[PDB]
Amino acid sequence: YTIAERPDLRVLRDPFSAKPHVLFYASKRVGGDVSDFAAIKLLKFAA
Amino acid sequence: ALNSAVAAE
Numbered sequence: 344y345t346i347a348e349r350p351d352l353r354v355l356r357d358p359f360s361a362k363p364h365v366l367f368y369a370s371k372r373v374g375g376d377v378s379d380f381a382a383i384k385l386l387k388f389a390a
Numbered sequence: 391a392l393n394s395a396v397a398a399e
Contacts, residue, residue, distance in 0.1 A: 344383070348373040 352371040360366060377383060393399055 344375060345378040346373065346375040348375075 349372045352369060354367060354369045357366045357368060391399070
């Protein structure tokens with residue numbers, strides 16, 4: 344499994360947008376699926 | 391947090 348991501352959580356406070364409200368906007372970006380299908384095996388409970 | 395004083399939240 345390869346987790347490819349940008350290693351920072353950016354917080355932007357917006358007193359400019361809504362006037363009595365600060366409205367903290369935080370975001371971080373991340374993604375991933377399996378890179379090597381052989382490297383994971385699973386257990387299955389049917390039969 | 392959201393909504394100052396006035397509300398319980």
